[PDB]
RNA sequence: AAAUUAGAUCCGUAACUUCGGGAUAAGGAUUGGCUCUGAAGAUUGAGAUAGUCGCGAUUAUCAAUUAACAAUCAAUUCAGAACUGGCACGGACUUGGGGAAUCCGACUGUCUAAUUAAAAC
RNA sequence: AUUCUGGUUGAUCCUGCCAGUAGUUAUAUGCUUGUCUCAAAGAUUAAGCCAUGCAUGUCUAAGUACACACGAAUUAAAAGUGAAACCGCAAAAGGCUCAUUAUAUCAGUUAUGGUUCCUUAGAUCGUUACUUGGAUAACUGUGGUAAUUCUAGAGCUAAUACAUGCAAUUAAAACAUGAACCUUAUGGGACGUGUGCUUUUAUUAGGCUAAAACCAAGCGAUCGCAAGAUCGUUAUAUUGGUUGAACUCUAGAUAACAUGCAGAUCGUAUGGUCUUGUACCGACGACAGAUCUUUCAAAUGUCUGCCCUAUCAACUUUUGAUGGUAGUAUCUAGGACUACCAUGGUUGCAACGGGUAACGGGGAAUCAGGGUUCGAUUCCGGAGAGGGAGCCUGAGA
RNA sequence: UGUGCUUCAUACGUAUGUAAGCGUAUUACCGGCCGGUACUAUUACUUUGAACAAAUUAGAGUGCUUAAAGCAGGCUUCAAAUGCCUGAAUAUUCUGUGCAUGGGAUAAUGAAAUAAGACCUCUGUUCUGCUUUCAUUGGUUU
RNA sequence: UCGCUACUACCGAUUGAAUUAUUUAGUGAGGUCUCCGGACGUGAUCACUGUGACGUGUUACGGUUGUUUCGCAAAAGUUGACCGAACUUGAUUAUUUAGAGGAAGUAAAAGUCGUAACAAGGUUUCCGUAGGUGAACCUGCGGAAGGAUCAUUA
């Protein structure tokens, strides 16, 4: 993302940039571990060589997925590491036996491990602790991945 | 906590798995926070006046339990409303009674007078194996009897028989696809054995498939599943005949219609 | 009192939620600490159920830890140089969490050449023209008890250039890592490798 | 007649209306001194790597700078905070009272030098 | 117990409404009433005010008992009843009501690994007089103001109230530091020191597929006369852990930390042992103990679901609105609050505003079905005690 | 990818309504046809479930004398008699959301275009990595 | 149309009147927290005084002493913040209400005036639009048949 452009030192908690004192001799010089949330979600390679920290990321921060896993299509992606999704469904009414179409918007935290998140890509989200005032969900898998029609161009 | 914690509980709000009548009082026994939860309890005003009919008022129960004649799980338990849930061996050596609270197939419990030799141990399942209690290991039981220093092959989802004089393990029955089981908590209550297959849903709420001796395959959550031995292994005495998954009309045909009188 | 949850505070559409539950105790807030560098005060506040935390207005001393050692030597706290939350908190010398702070640099150096007897970082050699006479009362080797352990090191004793220059001045840059309004103390670690080079670029290049 | 208001910054502003207005409507808040803090510019940027000859003088370069690149230098304005006294602070001076209507003339303009400046022209 | 009749015309067939029709735990009211079983009942208007009376107090052989108030007999054991008073606990449940409240409450679902917790049960309790300090009620005694409510001054005295305080806290063992140790190595020591838990910070391991080519110590082992040279066996990436996982999580070690806390308590029996000599030990319960695990809960958050209104189309954001970031604050997440950046966020799938004679839901009334109307009302949940605000003690307001 | 044939299990030469055999391979191993076992384009719909308060409601059973109710009671029996016997159902509801499982008709989206198409040319050109052994422990490195 | 008798609802000077909640500014009771503060009530030392004891050099016990050292807490009162009732003012809503005059509607047929329409209603009617007129109505322009023509005129 941006490399320490805040007033504080944006640092990963509990990791150490230290070499002098260590029991044994065990270096291997890749010092940040990643969580794997392991719910079917292969963690990306950029959560291993990740220069971002993101204290609200579920792989490299102190949030962990629990509760509902939902899906949604992106509509706007303009906030700082935060998107909003569209979640389209139907509400059946029984004095007509027809469907009534509704939707909701969810303020969703977008981890910086997902480069190039656009609307309208499909996104699988998952519930967390209250992250900021309306956010309660992290992205877990943006379901476009490749460009199946937008990275396509003939010749 | 919000001006709590609600010391009362009403009749027609206590469960009808204890078969309380709608008239007979405004209130309900309200068990005093023991090992078992409230909706999985039988307070000792129920077991003495309503069931055994040793009393006839509510005052004639504190004139029983305060004389230390009652004995829940070897200890005395002079609490007049002790919860005393699943498989709590109420071992009355006077006047030689030796019950055990095992649950009936109709969703309810049933009075089951057991043998006095196997009364002095009971079977209980484990919930969380963890470190920290002395010295490193301990596990918690379904009633919550934390017992230290267990076998390192007892994981969760298994049961161990606890002697009532000690607090020590003697045998473990672990969760394989050959072990007969028992259900407590859902619509499938009281039905006994045997396991087929468990569907592990990662995060969360695994369900498991259970096949009765009639071939009656069904399913319930893994939370409700106790375990009481291997295939055709009753490791405790069970009550009336196993919870066969009777039909609805067959109980109206077994003894209600086919009735000698 | 001060309240902490959203009885007020209009919703995500822009709309005014009205009334919401007259005022409840369990969502209270408290007036802050603003722990200055005055020596030695603590008030303790009775908190939610039965407990107590230490509201340590006016602290002066802290259990600071050189993280690259596995050491934690208590010092006193000298100066509050930099802070990312405000500059009202630097100027009034208030200690909260991670204020960049200046401590003592002495109870680490005596601990340093206790286990790492190699003399660095060295001061002006006009003072160092004679010793009293340290290099033998350091180790003396005994021929041979416990003490050859001080020479299979020297692999550890090359603390970086931007830290040993900050030891010769006898005051070092640290960082608070406790909650002085809550934990009752102002402890912390010290800047070594790149937490240093960020927070020191923040000072002398801004001026 | 006299008093009241008055600078500036900020907020807020009705009936009507030729939609331009009315309007500085009305109505309120702020304002000194002293110590700092923030923001808004310019100009060269800054060049890393043999040694001939004896590092020294004749002596190299595509680009990447970069995310405060580093010093110099330049004016002045605007926001913020802490402390601080007889609330005296636009401390003199410079400097609008406002509003609800009726009549006449639309407006700016012109007039009886020396009694009428208007609704007259 | 899926039905319709009268009324527009001089008569007709229609559209059409009016009028009939029946039910209503649905209110009032009118007239009359011999039983009897159940029984709703100041909700509607005024959540408008209120005479009087009561609705919260509590003792075991087991915290403290100096009452002749009553028991007995020179035994301190009175172990009796125990009034009072102290201390402990409870008084935050219930009970009443429906003003407020329109995604708010509520209902279901799911979460808390984002927290907290009296009690209850279960497990757990070594790193200088060991048996103590003072001071108050009850009680006595003299008082005050219109005024009983209120309370002062003095003399007494307790504890499981308040306060201090373990010589086995006891080290070997463990293990750093020195130490009378002294050797070509997966090598050895007397002793002096130190090592409660808890909080805080910091570090390091953190749940894990297989071998050699070659090599310094050549120790195990081999060869070269040897200086030694080529090799090599295992105990050595040795902690639960969701069986979704850098759970900062319960465990552990390291380097510290400050500051507290740490069993000077009680009834019934006593004999093993008598020298009746503080040499010799049961069963019980507790103002109480501390950590972990439970449990009665809570409080937040997830995903859906609410009435009328466009003669309400754009709202939010100075004064938090949407996000980032560091903080503070709280039991904890979080614009909850602050400071600095970013300019977001909701919207014809009805946002925002308004109305409500709106507490929500279970449920109730009525029909063949589809449904309409109601739910102040005994059950769960929310809410409040003339109107607002504040707050103490308490695990909990 | 709709079925056809070959059939056989199965209502009466006829009827497959359970299934098996050809349309080149409706998922690879071991076990004694049978289990562990590797692998699941998607959503709506639908099957059966799970899961969850009671009262109400539906209503099972029952002579409170009946009844609305009630959750009791009944029997051996006029008894003596821990002397027995069984109760105290099952459901609409808490309609939908959400979860598990079967189905794949219907209805949308999805894919391979001068190929950032597939298996393959499994080439080693490139990889990533780290626990087993270099006695212990360090270097040379496959 | 007009006239008498009623009834409802409008418009309207008064920049009317009364509420109702919601807030901008202003003041402001209390309280939490905080900066100090230090009544009284101890600790405790400084000396000691009453005596004895040792070698009067030093100490033991008493004086709620003398009076300096040193604390320990702690009431009143206070400084600053923060929650904030409350009243005063302004605006904003959301209802209700008094009003000279003005003007529509309904009931009321039995009043006056004329006859607009329905019969080729005696000028066919209706519509849109303008103007005019005591009143129904009239007239222009355009339209329609719901017309009095479904039309016969190589």
Q: End-to-end CA distance of chain C: give it in Å, rounded.
A: 42
- The distance of Cα B47 from the centroid of its chain, to the nearest Å, equals 14
Question: Which residue bears the tokens 């001080």?
Answer: C150
Q: In A, which residues are within 8 Å of B202 by CB distance?
A: 38-40
Q: Tokens standing for A71?
A: 């899906």
Element of type H or E holding C63: strand C61-65
**Helix, strand or coil for residue C165?**
helix
Torsion of CA C108, C111, C115, C120, to 10 degrees: 50
A37 close to A64: Cβ distance less than 8 angstroms: yes
Which nucleotide's C1' atom has the smallest distance to the CA of B240? F86
**What's the CA gap between A143 and B132, in Å, rounded?**
43
Asked if B100 and B235 touch (Cβ cutoff 8 Å), the reply is: no
The distance of Cα B217 from the centroid of its chain, to the nearest Å, equals 23
- Asked if A66 has any chain B CB less than 8 Å from its own CB, the reply is yes
Residue B229: phi, psi to the nearest 5? 130, 180
Residue B36 CA to residue A88 CA, distance in Å, equals: 44
Q: Is the CB of B248 under 7 A from strand F?
A: yes
Residue B200, C-beta contacts closer than 8 angstroms, at least 6 positions apart: B206
Question: C54, C94 in Cβ contact below 8 A?
Answer: no
**Strand pairing category for C73-76 and A135-142:** unpaired
Tally of residues, chain C? 207
The whole-angstrom separation of Cα C15 and Cα A154 is: 49
Of C12, C156, C198, the CB nearest to A134: C12
What CA–CA distance (Å, rounded) separates B143 from B39? 13
- Euclidean distance between CA atoms B140 and B125, whole angstroms: 9
| B75 vs B54: CA distance, rounded Å | 21
Nearest to B43 by CA among B69, B113, B51, B141: B51
Whether the link from the prior residue into A103 is cis, omega within 30° of 0, is no
The residues facing B222 across adjacent strands are none
Give the integer Cα–Cα distance in Å for A7 and A28: 31
Q: Which residues contact A95 (CB under 8 A, 6 or more apart)?
A: none
The single-letter DSSP state of residue A42 is P
Helix (H) or strand (E) holding C79: strand C79-82
Q: How far is CA A9 from the centre of its chain?
A: 22
Nearest CB to C68 within list A11, A21, A134: A21
Assigned token pair, A2: 């941006």
Interacting residues of A86 by C-beta distance below 8 A, sequence separation 6+: A72, A73, A74, A75, A103, A105, A120
Alpha carbons B236 and B255: distance in angstroms, whole number = 27
Token code pair at residue B141: 């039981």
Residue B75 near residue B130, CB atoms below 8 Å: no
> By three-state DSSP, how is residue A144 classified?
coil
What distance in Å separates the CA atoms of residue B160 and residue B122, rounded to the nearest whole number?
9
| Distant-in-sequence, close-in-space partners of B242: CB < 8 Å, separation ≥ 6 | B192, B193, B213
CA of B192 to C1' of F5 (A): 49
* Phi/psi at B125 (5° precision): -100, 160
DSSP conformational letter for C151: T
Contact by Cβ (8 Å): C117, C147: no
At C102, give phi and psi (nearest 5°). Answer: -125, 130
Under an 8 A CB cutoff, do B202 and A40 touch? yes
Name residue, tokens 């003939």: A154
Statement: the CB of A71 is under 7 Å from strand E: no
Contacts of A138 (CB under 8 A, 6+ apart): A56, A57, A58, A63, A65, A108, A109, A111, A125, A126, A128, A131
Q: How far apart are CA C98 and CA C189, in angstroms?
A: 10
Backbone angles phi, psi at C161, to 5 degrees: -65, -40
Report residue C97 as tokens: 């969490």
Residue A54 DSSP SS3 = coil
Nearest to B238, CA basis, from B100, B90, B47, B85: B100
Tokens of B135: 């010295």
Contacts of A18 in chain C (CB under 8 A): 67-68, 192-193
A33: Cα within 13 Å, side-chain hemisphere: 6
Instruction: Let me know: does A77 contact A118? Beta carbons within 8 Å.
Output: yes
DSSP chain B: --S------BTTTS-TTS---SSS-SB-----S-SS-STT---TTIIIIIIS-S-SSSHHHHHHHTTT---BTTB----TT----TT--B--TTTT--EEEEE-TTSSEEEEE--TTTTTEEEEEEEEEEE-SSSSEEEEESS---EES--TT--SS-EEEEESSS--EEEEE---TT--EEE-SSTTTT-B--EEEEE--TTS--EEEEE-TTS-EEEEESSSEEE--STT--SS---TT------HHHHHHHTTTS---
- In A81-121, DSSP assigns E strands to 82-93, 98-109
Spatial contact of A61 and A48, defined as CB atoms under 8 Å apart: no
| Residue B129 contacts strand F, CB under 7 A | no
C1 touches strand G (CB under 7 A): yes
**Could you write out the DSSP letters of every residue in C37-62?**
S-SS--EEEE-STT-EEEE--S--EE
C155 CA, G109 C1': Å apart: 127
Q: What are phi and psi of C138, to 5 degrees?
A: -60, -65
Give SS3 for A109: strand
Task: Enter the resolution in angstroms.
Answer: 3.0
State whether the beta carbon of C2 lies below 7 angstroms from any atom of strand G.
Answer: yes
Tell which strand F nucleotides have any atom below 7 Å from a protein Cβ.
36, 44-45, 49-56, 60-61, 70-72, 74-76, 82, 85-91, 95-96, 98-101, 110-114, 116, 130, 138
User: Where do we find the tokens 């909706």?
Assistant: B39
Cβ neighbours for B89, distance < 8 A, ≥ 6 positions apart: B72, B73, B74, B98, B99, B100, B114, B119, B120, B122, B164
How would you label C98-121 residue by residue, b for 16+ Cβ within 10 Å and e otherwise? bbbbbbbbeebbeebeeebbebee
3-state secondary structure at position C28: strand
Question: What does the DSSP assignment read for C175-205?
Answer: EE-S-TTTBS---EEE--SSHHHHHHHHHHT
Look up residue B4 and give its two tokens.
């709590």
- Using CA atoms, how far apart are residues A121 and C192, in angstroms rounded to an integer? 43
Q: Is C98–A17 a contact, with Cβ atoms under 8 angstroms apart?
A: no
Beta bridge partners of C198: none
């Amino acid at each position: 993302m941006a490399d320490q452009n805040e007033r504080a030192f944006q640092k990963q908690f509990g990791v150490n940039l230290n070499r002098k004192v260590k029991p044994g001799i065990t270096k291997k010089k890749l010092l940040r571990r990643s969580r794997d949330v392991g719910l079917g979600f292969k963690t990306p390679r950029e959560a291993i060589d990740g220069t971002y920290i993101d204290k609200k990321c579920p792989w490299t921060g102190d949030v962990r997925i629990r509760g509902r896993i939902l899906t949604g299509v992106v509509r706007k992606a303009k906030m700082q590491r935060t998107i909003v999704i569209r979640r389209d469904y139907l509400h059946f009414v029984r004095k007509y036996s027809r469907f009534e179409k509704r939707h909701r918007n969810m303020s969703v935290h977008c981890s910086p491990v997902f480069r190039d998140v656009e609307h309208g890509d499909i996104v699988t989200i998952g519930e967390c602790r209250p992250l900021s005032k309306t956010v309660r969900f992290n992205v877990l898998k943006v379901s476009k991945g490749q460009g199946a029609k937008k990275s396509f161009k003939k010749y | 906590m919000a001006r709590g914690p609600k010391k009362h509980l009403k009749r027609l709000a206590a469960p009808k798995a204890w078969m309380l009548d709608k008239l007979g009082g405004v209130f309900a026994p309200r068990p005093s926070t023991g090992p078992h939860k409230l909706r999985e309890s039988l307070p000792l005003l129920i077991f003495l006046r309503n069931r055994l009919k040793y009393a006839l008022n509510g005052a004639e129960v504190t004139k029983i339990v305060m004389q230390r004649l009652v004995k829940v799980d070897g200890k005395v338990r002079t609490d007049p409303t002790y919860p005393a849930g699943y498989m709590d061996v109420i071992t009355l050596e006077k006047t030689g009674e030796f019950f055990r609270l095992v649950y009936d197939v109709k969703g309810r419990f049933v009075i089951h007078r057991i043998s006095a030799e196997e009364a002095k141990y009971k079977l209980c399942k484990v919930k969380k194996t963890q470190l920290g209690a002395k010295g490193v290991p301990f596990l918690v039981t379904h009633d919550g009897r934390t017992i230290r220093y267990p076998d390192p092959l007892i994981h969760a989802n298994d049961s161990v028989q606890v002697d009532i004089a000690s607090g020590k393990i003697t045998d473990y029955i672990k969760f394989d696809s050959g072990n007969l089981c028992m259900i407590t908590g859902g619509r499938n209550l009281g039905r006994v054995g045997t396991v087929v297959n468990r569907e592990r849903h990662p995060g969360s709420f695994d369900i498991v498939h259970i096949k009765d001796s009639q071939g009656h395959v069904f399913a319930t959550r893994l939370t409700n599943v106790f375990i009481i031995g291997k295939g055709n292994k009753p490791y405790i005495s069970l009550p009336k005949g196993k919870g066969v998954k009777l039909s609805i009309a067959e109980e109206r045909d077994k003894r209600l219609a086919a009735k000698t009188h | 009192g001060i309240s902490r949850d959203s009885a007020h505070k209009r919703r995500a559409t822009g709309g005014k939620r009205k009334s919401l539950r007259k005022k409840r105790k369990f969502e209270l807030g408290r007036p802050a600490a603003n722990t200055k560098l005055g020596s030695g005060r603590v008030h303790k506040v009775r908190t939610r159920g039965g407990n107590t935390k230490l509201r340590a207005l006016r602290l002066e001393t802290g259990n600071f830890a050189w993280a690259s050692e596995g050491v934690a030597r208590k010092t006193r706290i000298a100066d509050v140089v930099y802070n990312a939350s405000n500059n009202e908190l630097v100027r009034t010398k208030t200690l909260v969490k991670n204020s960049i702070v200046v401590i003592d640099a002495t109870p680490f150096r005596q601990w340093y050449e206790a286990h790492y007897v190699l003399p660095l970082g060295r001061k002006r050699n006009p003072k160092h023209a004679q010793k009293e006479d340290e290099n033998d009362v350091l180790t003396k080797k005994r021929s041979e008890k416990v003490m050859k352990k001080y020479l299979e090191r020297q692999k550890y004793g090359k603390v970086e250039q931007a830290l040993e220059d900050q030891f010769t001045s006898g005051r070092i840059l640290a960082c608070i890592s406790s909650r002085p309004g809550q934990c009752g103390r102002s402890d912390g670690y010290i800047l070594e490798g790149k937490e240093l080079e960020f927070y020191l670029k923040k000072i002398k290049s801004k001026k």
